[PDB]
Amino acid sequence: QVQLQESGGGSVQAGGSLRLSCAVSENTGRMGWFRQAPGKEREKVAIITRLGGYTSYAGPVKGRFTISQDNAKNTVYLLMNSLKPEDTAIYYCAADSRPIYSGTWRYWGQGTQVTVSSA
Ligand SMILES: [Cl-]
Ligand SMILES: [Cl-]
Ligand SMILES: [Cl-]
Ligand SMILES: [Mg+2]
């Protein structure tokens, strides 16, 4: 099995930044970040291959968030800039060695809450 562990969640002022990280227990072919707003379908945020140069982003975070990886540490990061209230959600990482475009991901982290507020 593969285990995953997210870190770096919390609450921040709108317009601020966060950086989520995800420890993956062993080498996998792909890794991704997902988010699930209240009552809503879980959605792709950003995905990455371990070896290629491939990344893909959800439209609404394109150009604000960046996915990156540290291969030596088996860690995947989600740098989140210019945060908006609509970025509020539980953020999860996932990984496996299924083909890059596959809709189902075999191994999931625990999630962490992200709350963005204007106040
Ligand atoms: Cl920022
Ligand atoms: Cl797999
Ligand atoms: Cl699941
Ligand atoms: Mg999209």
| Burial (0-12, 13-18, 19+ Cβ within 10 Å), 56 | middle
* Residue 98 CA to ligand 2 centre (angstroms): 5
Of 52, 32, 9, whose CA–CA distance to 96 is shortest?
32
Q: How far is the CA of 27 from the centre of ligand 2 (A)?
A: 11
Alpha carbon distance 72, 91 (integer Å): 23
Residues bordering ligand 1, an ion, CB closer than 5 Å: 17, 81
> Ligand 1 mean position to 38 CA, how many Å?
24
3 with 25: CB under 8 angstroms? Answer: yes
Q: In total, how many domains does the chain have?
A: 1
Number of residues that this document lists for the chain: 119
Rg (CA), the chain: 13
Ligand nearest to the CA of 28: 2
Enclosing domain of residue 85? 1-119
DSSP string covering 38-102, please?
TTS--EEEEEEESSSS-EEE-GGGTTTEEEEEEGGGTEEEEEE-S--GGG-EEEEEEEESS-TT-
Taking the centre of ligand 2 as the mean of its atom positions, its distance from the CA of residue 75, in whole angstroms, is 17
Which residues are found with C-beta within 5 Å of the ion, ligand 3? 108
Within 10 Å of residue 73's Cβ, how many Cβ atoms? 11
Question: Solved how?
Answer: X-ray
Q: What is the CATH classification number for the domain harbouring 99?
A: 2.60.40.10
